[PDB]
Amino acid sequence: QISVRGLAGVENVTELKKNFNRHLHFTLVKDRNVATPRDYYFALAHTVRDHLVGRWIRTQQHYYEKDPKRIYYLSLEFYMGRTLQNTMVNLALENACDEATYQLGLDMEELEEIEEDAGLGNGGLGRLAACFLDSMATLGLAAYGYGIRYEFGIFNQKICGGWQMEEADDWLRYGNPWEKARPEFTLPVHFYGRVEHTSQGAKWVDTQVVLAMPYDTPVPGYRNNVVNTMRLWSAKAPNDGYIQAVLDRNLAENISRVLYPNDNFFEGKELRLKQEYFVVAATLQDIIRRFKSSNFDAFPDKVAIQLNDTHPSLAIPELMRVLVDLERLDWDKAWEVTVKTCAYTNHTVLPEALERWPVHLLETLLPRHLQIIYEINQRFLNRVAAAFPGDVDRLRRMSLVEEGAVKRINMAHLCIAGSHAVNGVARIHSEILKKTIFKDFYELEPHKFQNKTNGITPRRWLVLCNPGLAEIIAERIGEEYISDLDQLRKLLSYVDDEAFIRDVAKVKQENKLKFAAYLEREYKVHINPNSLFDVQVKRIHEYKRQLLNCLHVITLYNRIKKEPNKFVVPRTVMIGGKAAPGYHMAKMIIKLITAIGDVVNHDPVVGDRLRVIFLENYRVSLAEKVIPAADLSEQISTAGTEASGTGNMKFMLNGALTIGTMDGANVEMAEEAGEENFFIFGMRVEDVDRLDQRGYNAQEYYDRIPELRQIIEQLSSGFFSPKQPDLFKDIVNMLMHHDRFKVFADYEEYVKCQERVSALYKNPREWTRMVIRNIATSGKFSSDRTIAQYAREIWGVEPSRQRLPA
Amino acid sequence: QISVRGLAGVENVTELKKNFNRHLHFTLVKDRNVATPRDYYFALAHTVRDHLVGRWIRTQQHYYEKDPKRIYYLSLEFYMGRTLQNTMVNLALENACDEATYQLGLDMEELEEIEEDAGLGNGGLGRLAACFLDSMATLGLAAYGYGIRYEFGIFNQKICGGWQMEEADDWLRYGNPWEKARPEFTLPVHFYGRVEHTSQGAKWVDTQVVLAMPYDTPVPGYRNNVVNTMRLWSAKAPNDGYIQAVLDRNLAENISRVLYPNDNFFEGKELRLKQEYFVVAATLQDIIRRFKSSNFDAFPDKVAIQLNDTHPSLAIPELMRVLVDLERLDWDKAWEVTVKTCAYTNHTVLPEALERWPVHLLETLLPRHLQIIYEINQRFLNRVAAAFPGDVDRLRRMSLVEEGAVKRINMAHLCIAGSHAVNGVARIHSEILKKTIFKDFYELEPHKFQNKTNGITPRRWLVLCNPGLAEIIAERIGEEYISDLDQLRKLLSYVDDEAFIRDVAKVKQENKLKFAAYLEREYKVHINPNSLFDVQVKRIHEYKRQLLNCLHVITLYNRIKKEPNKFVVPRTVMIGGKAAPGYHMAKMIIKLITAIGDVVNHDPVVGDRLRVIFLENYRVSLAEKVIPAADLSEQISTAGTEASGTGNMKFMLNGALTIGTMDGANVEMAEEAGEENFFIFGMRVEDVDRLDQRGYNAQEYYDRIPELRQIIEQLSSGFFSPKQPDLFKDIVNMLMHHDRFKVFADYEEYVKCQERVSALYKNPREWTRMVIRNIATSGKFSSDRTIAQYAREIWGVEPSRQRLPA
Ligand SMILES: O=C1NC(c2ccccc2)=N[C@@]12O[C@H](CO)[C@@H](O)[C@H](O)[C@H]2O
Ligand SMILES: O=C1NC(c2ccccc2)=N[C@@]12O[C@H](CO)[C@@H](O)[C@H](O)[C@H]2O
Ligand SMILES: *Cc1c(COP(=O)(O)O)cnc(C)c1O
Ligand SMILES: *Cc1c(COP(=O)(O)O)cnc(C)c1O
Known part of the structure; x- marks a missing residue:
């Protein structure tokens, strides 16, 4: 074929x-x-x-x-x-x-x-x-x-x-x-x-x-x-x-x-x-x-x-x-x-x-x-x-x-x-x-x-899981890149090629249609394939800050509700991962994710502007399906905590843009593609250390950011857990008094940066040109x-x- | 071949x-x-x-x-x-x-x-x-x-x-x-x-x-x-x-x-x-x-x-x-x-x-x-x-x-x-x-x-384990008997055929040479292949009366010692079987067998007239080796205790004569071959019942049979367990006071009958003619x-x- x-x-x-x-x-x-x-x-x-x-x-x-x-x-x-x-x-x-x-x-x-x-x-x-x-x-x-x-x-x-x-x-x-x-x-x-x-x-x-x-x-x-x-x-x-x-x-x-x-x-x-x-x-x-x-x-x-x-x-x-x-x-x-x-x-x-x-x-x-x-x-x-x-x-x-x-x-x-x-x-x-x-x-x-x-191996993580992307690349530059991934740089010479832009965007849309269908079939719920696919898949850990993602998602919801009749770039937010069985907080986070989903996905006013899906049983074979389908890769660990990460590299190779912190291999990824082609936000490692020296007071953020305060009140009062008002008291208490990973410290910059993503997604051609700049510089991560x-x-x-x- | x-x-x-x-x-x-x-x-x-x-x-x-x-x-x-x-x-x-x-x-x-x-x-x-x-x-x-x-x-x-x-x-x-x-x-x-x-x-x-x-x-x-x-x-x-x-x-x-x-x-x-x-x-x-x-x-x-x-x-x-x-x-x-x-x-x-x-x-x-x-x-x-x-x-x-x-x-x-x-x-x-x-x-x-x-299936139990016997039969009467074993009766017409007598005896001797070698190789001890192969292989049970066999073996030993310079038909007595792991008496019997062997097989005066071997790990594949090699089949259960037995049939088919009681299928085997072609001894079922009604007193036998009394004294005094004089006290005590299977009651008839076996073995041609009469009537036991x-x-x-x- x-x-x-x-x-x-x-x-x-x-x-x-x-x-x-x-x-x-x-x-x-x-x-x-x-x-x-x-x-x-x-x-x-x-x-x-x-x-x-x-x-x-x-x-x-x-x-x-x-x-x-x-x-x-x-x-x-x-x-x-x-x-x-x-x-x-x-x-x-x-x-x-x-x-x-x-x-x-x-x-x-x-x-x-x-x-x-x-x-x-x-x-x-x-x-x-x-x-x-x-x-x-x-x-x-x-x-x-x-x-x-x-x-x-x-x-x-x-x-x-x-x-x-x-x-x-x-x-x-x-x-x-x-x-x-x-x-x-x-x-x-x-x-x-x-x-x-x-x-x-x-x-x-x-x-x-x-x-x-x-x-x-x-x-x-x-x-x-x-x-x-x-x-x-x-x-x-x-x-x-x-x-x-x-x-x-x-x-x-x-x-x-x-x-x-x-x-x-x-x-x-x-x-x-x-x-x-x-x-x-x-x-x-x-x-x-x-x-x-x-x-x-x-x-x-x-x-x-x-x-x-x-x-x-x-x-x-x-x-x-x-x-x-x-x-x-x-x-x-x-x-x-x-x-x-x-x-x-x-x-x-x-x-x-x-x-x-x-x-x-x-x-x-x-x-x-x-x-x-x-x-x-x-x-x-x-x-x-x-x-x-x-x-x-x-x-x-x-x-x-x-x-x-x-x-x-x-x-x-x-x-x-x-x-x-x-x-x-x-x-x-x-x-x-x-x-x-x-x-x-x-x-x-x-x-x-x-x-x-x-x-990452470009065999499993490109040829195998994304044959269509592999093919349109091979059409331009031959097959040698599969065992010499630096050859991908030759794609920089196609960044203004109208037909290659068309091909890259077509493959992505096909991967999204394919994955949207897979959701409906194996786990019967409907998703808008023309939405931005915002995915965070990785094990559930406090340091990987799925919670920061949760805060952003609730922010988008609260903004829609406040101004229902205003345009927003529609999103499917997908989060998946296993929690270690004795890791209480990780188990609470999964629950919070599904609780948010239950509220957001059933609100008539939201419609298909915003969907939140928890991807069940994240494993290698699910990664091969969802990663080719992704538009935005969430790599939002607190600076200094993610030794490298490798999911980050899989997404870069497969035509998603990255929102992330200057942590792990994200630093080298942004360096290879250029910072202007990467959605960098948040504290650097040095910033975290400066905060630690004077002491992290989360209250300070709660006091100064109205949007954040609203979210914390919702969690507390049972907005997301009606029959169990205090279900999420462990999460609030940790965020307010015992947060090692400084979720609130990166909240403002994350939301602003998430706006810039939405803005670029509004411009298909420039989004796709940025994608090409990522794929083309992913060679180092073979x-x-x-x-x-x-x-x-x-x-x-x-x-x-x-x-x-x- | x-x-x-x-x-x-x-x-x-x-x-x-x-x-x-x-x-x-x-x-x-x-x-x-x-x-x-x-x-x-x-x-x-x-x-x-x-x-x-x-x-x-x-x-x-x-x-x-x-x-x-x-x-x-x-x-x-x-x-x-x-x-x-x-x-x-x-x-x-x-x-x-x-x-x-x-x-x-x-x-x-x-x-x-x-x-x-x-x-x-x-x-x-x-x-x-x-x-x-x-x-x-x-x-x-x-x-x-x-x-x-x-x-x-x-x-x-x-x-x-x-x-x-x-x-x-x-x-x-x-x-x-x-x-x-x-x-x-x-x-x-x-x-x-x-x-x-x-x-x-x-x-x-x-x-x-x-x-x-x-x-x-x-x-x-x-x-x-x-x-x-x-x-x-x-x-x-x-x-x-x-x-x-x-x-x-x-x-x-x-x-x-x-x-x-x-x-x-x-x-x-x-x-x-x-x-x-x-x-x-x-x-x-x-x-x-x-x-x-x-x-x-x-x-x-x-x-x-x-x-x-x-x-x-x-x-x-x-x-x-x-x-x-x-x-x-x-x-x-x-x-x-x-x-x-x-x-x-x-x-x-x-x-x-x-x-x-x-x-x-x-x-x-x-x-x-x-x-x-x-x-x-x-x-x-x-x-x-x-x-x-x-x-x-x-x-x-x-x-x-x-x-x-x-x-x-x-x-x-x-x-x-x-x-x-x-x-x-x-x-x-x-x-x-x-x-x-x-x-x-x-x-x-x-x-x-x-x-x-x-x-028993004549496939495993003749063709497979004894191909040479299968062949010399097929030479005379064709192969149809393998799935119609009654055809073996046609061998009655060869009982006086000198060449068939020669063939039957040759196959047996070949099977004995083969098995004698197997002993020397896998379990390094030497055995006279020209001796009568006396085998009892079956699970170790009181009712199967391995102990009766032990008594006969000790009798032969005591007779040799008494009259060292007299001829006796030489024998290899082979006994094999597993005891159920919690069955104390069965475990003692195995030990007694090996104890007898240690004495008999190292006595210079006995020489190779008498050998006692315990066959280790008796299982189906060992049965396929030893049964074709056997001359005498020991089927000596107390009358009424062995429901049928099937080993008995395997040996009949494979050219060994049977010494046994009128128990189980032995009765039908003797009936098929004729009682004159079978070494029958001991109480019938009716005799056992008559004994039970008046009461079994083992002392009576000990008092009246000097040969038996000698054996019991040897066991007691530590003749067979020097370093542990009272090792076999459980066995003696059971034989004297609590023997459900009336070992002493059948002792005299067993020893006399064992003499008649030795007598016939002295005459190769008539032994082999009797064998033919057994093989030829084994058809019913397919x-x-x-x-x-x-x-x-x-x-x-x-x-x-x-x-x-x-
Ligand atoms: O995924 C990982 N698991 C562990 C790890 C878990 C338990 C004990 C010790 C280490 N270290 C990790 O190694 C990856 C491969 O180098 C890095 O990409 C991750 O950043 C890092 O978190
Ligand atoms: O070999 C046998 N095992 C048992 C048996 C063991 C435990 C519980 C119940 C039965 N019965 C036996 O069945 C054989 C096949 O019919 C007969 O030839 C034996 O005489 C008889 O002893
Ligand atoms: C690559 C991969 C990971 C590691 O992802 P990170 O985002 O670096 O934590 C974990 N699980 C599966 C199944 C993967 O394929
Ligand atoms: C035939 C056979 C038996 C049964 O033998 P009996 O003499 O009837 O007790 C037990 N074990 C094995 C391995 C056999 O082949």
Whole structure:
């Protein structure tokens, strides 16, 4: 149909049809009279998966022959989404499969919707891991993603009476055709026990054994015939009254049962620590086994381990344990190897998110690792003492061990000490690390600290989710940009091209019609497709300030009511996201959003000027639908709180304008497109600090802004909760007395800036010209650029766009 | 190689090799440089499974078109064993696959050994279900096996220091290629709740829901291109703090987690009752759904439900519940349908094995079913009262409800009342049912009571496990006997044929050499292959009198020691079996067996005249090895205790002579072969009763038999337990004061009879002639005969040996 989806060759199509019918008959054990649409999806999945296999086997064989340095991306989260369409795109099979399925009388798009998201992540961090895997494969790196195969990913979200309900995401119910179990690579992991010191050295004894069974999922590079591996571990009980013993095996296997959904507040839960050690222990054994199939001085020349936040920080003490206790290297040599091998990416500055494990917990579960951490801490603090003699305060601040109520291990401190490289994930965030929370460590080892601004894969996030936009771009500048996104700059030469302006606006309107229909179908309510689509989709957090958005929405409503017969640019305000299940305020915000919607969407006087929709069950596959449909991207975190963000980049790439704060990668986005092409508002980081020094008094804003005072009175008095007048008292009280994120401080500038958006939207041609200026400068935010920087500046390997043989 | 294994056609072999390599590449995702022998087994399994699929799909399609009456074999146990070889035999693919694998440089026999037993049964009852499925497919019946897919089957047995240790049988670890999940046929099962009586009728409300997900396994008939289905249900939690809720899903799924291994003593465990209801509820919904795809008056013309003992007895109240509460039939009509549909097979008379569920348990878990059982009981006892006016004692004895300490439901009583047919499983057992435990029910409804003597499938139990014996038979009389075993009588005309005598003895010696080697390899100890192979393999039970065997073995030892320099026919005594994990005495017997072995096998004076071996982990695949190797079959249960036995039949078919009591099917076996061709000894049933009336005094035997007294002194004094002198005090005490199975009463006759065995073994030619007389009359004990009798006399359908198209 469209060229960027590849060729439909006569042989190819005939072949695909033959294989499809073969899998239907032999794999599914069905005839065409009894096949459910799910059967058809599965037949297609196996058929496509068949085209991966030779490439997978040869890629892994190639790495054995060439023995390149290997990259191990260690993460607790991989937010993969659906695999079928992505696999077809990267193998150039999409048009052939569309044709082959069409000829069998099937609509491929319908079959794609049957596939479950692999929702093995919470949000940004998990998705970043998934985008990185795609880029690593595309750049021909010998890279492996290592994580946990959770039986249950992020919960499915239902709204009942405006409230979030959580449902178990039973994603494996119907089987996963993408994965291959490898029971023959099963490895023991040890817990509890105690340490004996002998003549030979320390020995970890009387441990409990849990087994780690790997499942491998293929990761295809973009049309380079490279297929890398994602290895996820599953917990299995070892095989050594009777009934209960059998049933008790469940306890060991609980380790890999369920993704922890608390992306706000670190809770030191034992099961979570078990997960962290489990993935680390199984992975390092695998790494070392592979390393030996070809003396540890060469280890860092053959192995890079990237730590996705502190979640796999125990990689550092575990590697020491294996090198010292099992391989019998002396400490210093062992340590040298560890530091040159390991590198740490920090993904937050919010202090309640930092992992600070109680010592008593580590003492019980991982006694040997605690010993090793104490030894690391001692040697580290000896280096600090030597560098800064007398600075006792510095010693306390930098210690891996935090004193107080309960002793804790600061895992971030452990990571900086045990890594040759520490990076943030946007320039402003990496600066804040060096100025504030890791200033002491920076002063000791300035050379360790880097920036690696985040990116998104243009495969999933353009070609896949927005084929029409991809096509009209390819019509002008060819297809090379898909793996070299900087080529998008060539679109600057089309900013005054009348036909390209027409094409860009047509695609957007088509995406909106498509999504408007999807709303009506799956969640039956009607929306004006000619309205401005104002979307904020991301996890629900106070710092991301969905509440600021709520205030703006109520302002528009109050203005309409006041002057009903006046023109306003009509809007559909769409807000979506999951709240962590124990995060009360986030749950109240969702409820407030739906409460506003109930009022606004049923007011006769508003009509279709204003609509407020809560998008249920925001996940990767919903993002692929709504982001192409968006006009305005809401990136309105308080300055200094969003480490980078990545949604921001998805929208830029897909033809929406951004309203946002100078936070995270927004700063670099505005810099690339020019500030005049970006709706910047609010406090800078410096402003927030100035406010904090003199003290944030929210009352001041309530007193001086009549519009704001009206909103707060409405919330209080039950305007938005008639049957429950005081439902939102927690929200008002927080906004008035305990608002860490200074919602009121940015209110005035946000509303003024939102007016400028409405003003520009009134001018289709100039809106679309501004869009082109955004799309055309979004190249920097390709994860290909990000990974190329990791490769050259941290891992010490060169990327490649050269094909492997087919 | 041998003709009964089929043809190796040039196309066939080339095809199999092609498919094998295809599955290795695409299904296993391996090349030949990294393939483990397990990969090769899996590739072969998929290849063979591919030849089942068209036949499976067409068979099920045929049943839809023809809409024959359908047989539902309801069992908690299916002891299937390995599927690969059996599938090849029944599809005639064995020689082709042997050749195809050979040419790929693989030994098929080695690949077969990688397959795990599907050990979803304890022993005789479970295996009978598996033999029945094979016969039902072979006789072209529209039959379905319905059970539970246990995650863990019968435990693996290890002997440590002579003691049984149990290990979880994790049979699904590496996947099951034989099964096909059918998640789209998932069905709810309800538990707990309470009953509301409305205007419409009774309503079962506030229940907990567990889901039942079916897995279908193909059941190929012998070269008739029929493939029936075995459907096994798996428990899955329904999909409607957070972490713990997710983890708690395990509790629902515990229902299908593990096979109950207590084949001796009924324990009223709730989890066991959950299993029984779970299989019954899911199955009846499936039955009814199928019935509707084509008014319930016709139900019994389209449906037969066979109950494998009382384990699925709740089928009767469940069917009433659905007909009355959900379909709104009146009671009488509902009842008529139920009785004409259901039929009950009894498989024991030992009173501690009968299922007698506490009322309080049923009350809580299945409140509605208890109501229905009480109504059944009332109507039933009204019929008894009318038939036998004034016989109040009869009323008490026949009640479904037993009074006493705790009220119980007698499930056997429920089965007789709710079934149109009740059968035993050997003539003597069916007589005992009518004379003793169900005499009252027989007097009421004489027409219900039948015999259906058990059988074994000659496919697994001759062709598969003993190809050489199958071949030399086929050389004389052709292959038709494999599905018509009565043809074996034609071998009577070869009893004086010198060459056939030679062939029969050669095959036996080859089987012994083969098994002797297997011992040395897998469990490193040496055995004289020219000794008489004396084997007793079966679950460890007091009633099966492994202890009597132990006494004989110690007698032979004591006789050798007394007269060391005298000739005795050398023997290898092999005893194997699992004890139920809580069955103390059975665990002591295993220990005694190994204790005897430790003494006998290390005595220099004994040499290789006598060896005692405990066969570890007796299971279906070990039976296929040891039974063809046996000379003497030990079937020595106390008269009246073994309902039938089926091991007995396996050995008869495979060229061993039987020493046994007139118990179970032994009676019919001796009758078929002639008593002069059978080593019969001991009390008849009548003798046991005469002893019981005057009282069993074991002391009497100890006083009068010096040889026996010596054995008891040895056991007591620690002759067989030096470091633990009183280890076997429980065994002695039981034998002397509390022996329900009268071991001493049969001792003298057993030893004399064992001498006659030794005497005949001394004469190879006459031994072998006697063997021929056994093999030649074993035809009756084909499960084909058994199932044909069920079909005609209970189910009301005609068997067929006609082929379906290929
Ligand atoms: O999405 C994110 N989750 C976490 C995080 C959550 C819990 C504990 C630790 C970190 N950090 C985040 O990483 C993304 C990827 O770098 C950034 O784009 C986000 O700004 C940042 O919020
Ligand atoms: O092997 C058997 N197990 C049980 C049984 C076990 C527990 C509860 C109820 C029954 N009955 C048996 O059924 C076989 C098949 O009919 C008979 O050959 C055996 O003689 C008989 O012992
Ligand atoms: C990209 C993405 C995120 C991260 O979005 P931010 O706006 O950076 O928080 C979260 N969830 C999903 C499903 C995504 O696709
Ligand atoms: C046939 C068989 C049994 C039943 O044997 P009996 O001697 O009748 O008790 C038990 N277990 C296995 C593995 C079998 O193959």
